[PDB]
Symmetry: C3
Subunit: 470 residues, 3 copies
């Protein structure tokens, strides 16, 4: 590929994304699936609402296609529902918008698919078996062939990760709200995934934002006098985008409930210790992140620190919770063992009214409670394995060096390394909470955001306008 390309940020970000998606054809059949996964969840849940007759399926030998309605009625009953057509049109417009954007990506990743072949000499077979240090070093020393002088291996880092080094400095300085006292829990920590998307939509995307192009910001934000007129323009902007989150609040809420039922409700019956496992929260991914550190380099420490940190949390379980788990598993296991031994004896105490759903619900009640009960012979693991976690993730809040066994070291660590089911809970609440905390919580901090981009923005001569901390 060719002489003096127009955008060295969107180019290098797609060179990196092609390597991490393990090739062109793997990313292509990958991103087909999420367009099909959106289309499956919307079309199958619309068929369940309108076109399955449950009176035949519940009460009234019957076959499984006897419940289903014919296609001349399947397409008819769906249309005298003005709410559901309004759901299907706005879902349909968003989907064809996501279909146009995908065809635009195939034309653009094919030009970088040919960058590996014809300029870096790396096939799509050898590409999942290269590291990034392979792919990066091909770009650096072949710059005599393609212009695209002696940049650095560092100046490719500032271009792939320019707008990620701002979210590191906005979280470490608490210029984004991220934490709220509510009565009942204490100090809760927000910053879910749909909230981080808005923070760059306030700050980095569009003509009316900062950053007129993707590599330099406005000249407005470097002049002084503290410019409350310039800080006011950001202040009403969070309104018009925050009102947009409030009007689109009911339709993102429908999507998060549908997606959680289709991807977690069967895992509840089999293995509810899966949802009792923990995962590094998005607040923790922005707290343990370094400056100019790629997305696969963050994960290489967050997989190595997963194994100690998941057993650090297991040796702090609540005495009141374990005690309710052991005696709740006794009372449910005792009526199971009566019903289990009564089914083995005669096998006709099944098909009496509620017995088969009672074994199903008591069997998952016992399965939940066995997850809450820790290991009986759990080595209580002298609680400076926190110096093993500090070797992998490199930031501890400094109160934790000798106080590793308290509750001001256990409750602050669960803000970084939350449950899986709390992560499920914060994604369903996310359409509700996000327009409230942009309007009421982010707008008072607008004068410190505008002053942040004045004082900490350093222009480096090759890359452009970077964060000062990075």
């Amino acid at each position: 590929p060719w002489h003096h390309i127009e955008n060295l940020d969107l180019f290098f970000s797609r060179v990196y994304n092609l390597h991490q998606k393990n090739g062109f054809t793997c990313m292509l059949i990958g991103e087909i699936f999420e367009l099909m996964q959106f289309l499956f969840v919307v079309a199958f849940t619309t068929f369940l609402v309108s076109c399955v007759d449950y009176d035949i399926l519940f009460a009234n030998k019957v076959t499984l296609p006897d419940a289903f309605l014919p296609a001349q009625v399947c397409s008819a009953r769906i249309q005298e529902n003005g709410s559901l057509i309004t759901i299907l049109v706005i879902a349909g417009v968003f989907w064809i918008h996501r279909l146009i954007k995908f065809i635009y990506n195939i034309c653009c990743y094919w030009e970088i698919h040919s960058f590996y072949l014809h300029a870096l000499r790396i096939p799509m077979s050898a590409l999942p078996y290269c590291t990034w240090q392979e792919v990066q070093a091909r770009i650096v020393q072949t710059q005599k062939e393609h212009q695209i002088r002696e940049l650095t291996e560092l100046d490719i880092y500032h271009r792939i990760l320019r707008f990620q080094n701002y979210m590191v400095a906005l979280v470490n300085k608490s210029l984004l709200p991220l934490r709220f006292r509510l009565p009942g829990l204490g100090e809760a920590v927000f910053f879910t995934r749909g909230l981080k998307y808005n923070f760059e939509l306030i700050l980095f995307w569009g003509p009316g934002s900062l950053f007129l192009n993707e590599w330099s910001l406005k000249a407005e934000y470097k002049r002084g006098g503290q410019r409350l007129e310039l800080a006011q323009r950001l202040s009403n902007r969070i309104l018009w985008i925050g009102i947009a989150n409030f009007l689109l609040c009911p339709l993102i809420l429908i999507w998060q409930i549908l997606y959680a039922f289709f991807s977690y409700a069967e895992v509840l019956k089999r293995e509810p210790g899966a949802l009792g496992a923990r995962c590094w929260s998005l607040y923790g991914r922005c707290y343990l992140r370094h400056f100019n550190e790629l997305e696969h380099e963050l994960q290489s420490r967050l997989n190595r620190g997963y194994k100690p940190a998941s057993k650090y949390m297991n040796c702090f379980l609540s005495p009141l919770l374990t005690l309710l788990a052991k005696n709740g598993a006794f009372f449910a296991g005792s009526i199971l063992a009566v019903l289990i031994a009564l089914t083995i004896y005669d096998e006709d105490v099944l098909a009496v009214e509620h017995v088969l759903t009672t074994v199903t619900l008591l069997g998952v009640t016992v399965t939940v409670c066995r997850s809450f009960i820790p290991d009986q012979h759990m080595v209580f693991c002298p609680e400076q394995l926190l110096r093993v976690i500090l070797a992998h993730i490199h930031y501890m809040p400094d109160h934790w060096q000798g106080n590793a066994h308290r509750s001001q070291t256990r409750d602050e660590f669960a803000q970084l390394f939350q449950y899986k089911a709390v992560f499920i809970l914060e994604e369903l609440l996310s359409p509700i909470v996000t327009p409230l905390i942009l309007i009421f919580c982010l707008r008072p901090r607008a004068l410190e955001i505008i002053d942040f981009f004045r004082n900490f923005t350093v222009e480096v001569v090759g890359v452009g306008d970077t964060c000062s901390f990075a």
Copy 2:
């Protein structure tokens, strides 16, 4: 709490028990559960015996409350059963005796709940997150405030554990029987949990025992001439308590069978490798115990030595047992795989007569046999990982230093680290065996018990009459 308390043994034992039950309100809602767990097992098994009509439940659409009898017949059919009323009265008298004793404990632990707050400055929130070295050091250096001179940190150990340092010396000297040749197994080792309770009821509880109070013993047992008249008083005493175990034998036997069915019979269907796991036996807990070593300090080595010792036993499995397990799992898995593939084909070979209980019983037959089969790729673990177990539990019988692979190192170690299902078996046999071995086996050793408390009882000036070995 106040000046010169009357009983420094029962006080310090409850200071320790309040810390290990993780607080007042955790122990309170804890001990409510065992009063409810006794009341659940007795009332639910009485309802199953007398008030469920199984002819409607087995043979004669039916609902699950159609089997149950109405309350005017539920309370009527229970009374023309003179055995069951006799069961319910003696269970009822024992339960209200256990209810009076619990209300007496709330009044006494509340006085020690206020000892943490108003004398040690430790709340109930900070208490599960303290160690005993926290709680002990609060008691030691605040003795200028409360009298309760410069005792030691050692003299609190002799008071919490006075009657546990005797059971260490009575087991290590074999003054308690604990081992019996029966034809068929070899030398079996008893000492279950209801037997250890009686040994302190012969020796430490009551006015007619030794130890007139809880901290000093009689003057009778220090005089000499070997006192067969004094050894006779113990000899008929084991009769009157051993006859009491024989008369109360049928009602403790009913309780152990009921409790094992309500807490282990559903674990058989799911996971019978749970009952093939091993646990440190009560003979092992008194054999590996040190002198003046608290109950949580014994468990801290018995959890660290659990992980090597459970895989030391897995690399000694019987060749005759593995061979019957592999070929028994073939013959049962082959008729499963016919019946599994015959259910997938048509799904109406269910609801023909015994097929669904056959899949249930062959499925647990295969599940039992897969537990008996060891790992195919089991590293045969060079059998001096016995020097890893010796690091955690500190006593080996000295034959085992180089002979770690024989059967006189495997069968003596399973006396310390028995199966779980053998522990189940020794609790059901425990009402049967215990009155027999007090009358016939303990009474011949009464002259050596009386001479033991003459020769090994040292009076220390702060604590009182302690064991000489401790």
Copy 3:
């Protein structure tokens, strides 16, 4: 046992086999089982074909013995099937041949059962708890008692393993074919278990082979002139044995399909991650084998190298396979979670037509796909844990010292450490492929086989004719 035995190879091979089968009575009840396991698979699958009436079992309250036919019809319908009688006679002749050979082994292992008792002083109780270094040293220093002069501890190794040191040198020199390009996979590696049996039937068993007795070979194969007349005798011999594999091809094919259904088809429903586990292939067992190294000494490194090598293969999983596994588990788990939550709601959407087999087949579809999905938090294990595997298994093909992350280090290692399900696949194909590659692939290599036994056969004065490499 007595003076100057006639065959020191078959004696020492049975002294070793008695130790590895853990005794006389363990081997006796062991080898009864495989005669019963052959008889179970043949008789139970014959009853399923001819004597179960499925029209009563599928469509037409019924009992499970109502499907079965009476014995006067059970023995009648089996006889108007000229294919099945031909199957049962040839299975019956092979079984009574395997029954005569077993009674001949009881008479011969009893003479070596008395060799442990009356000449080595080792009972059958102490025998599973001895090592081979116990059993070998008993034979070596008691040679003053039994003649059976100062042989070596090495000269017992050449006698137990004489015909196994040839198969090491025939595989390392590629005088046996073992590898074939087919379009679609690349270079595949054969050498299944029924193929290795034939290679010693061409070379070591019979009067018409090499090795006139079990300890010395013919004088024919040491003379020179390259002897194409002598290489022709081997060339037509592989025909007459290869035609025998082709005529007996349909009846060994029936046995491998029957045995795989009776021992793996129920493991598919429970745990299909079992068949996704890997096992050291038979090509790998002959590639990592040393010279004069016993069968239990090979396994002691292949169990220690099992644990790193099974996680070396898990960190090379295909990006296209993981991506189809995650999105296939979404689409199947979403229709499960609808059907699971629809059964909990009413419990009468069971017994509508195909729902219960749909939960069964989608439940195993999700279970298969969760096996293909790797660990999310898998430490990517810096790929020179290949220096941990090289410590246990002692041969690496030398391209792998620094190239541990490519596909020419992953695909050559799966030839040594193949899947379990590929091992299942190569045993069902084994009756088909084996007569083809003896006739068409082994006969062109006959002149290099005849020249191999001329140049590499060294006569040692105690043992006889051994391989030169060993």
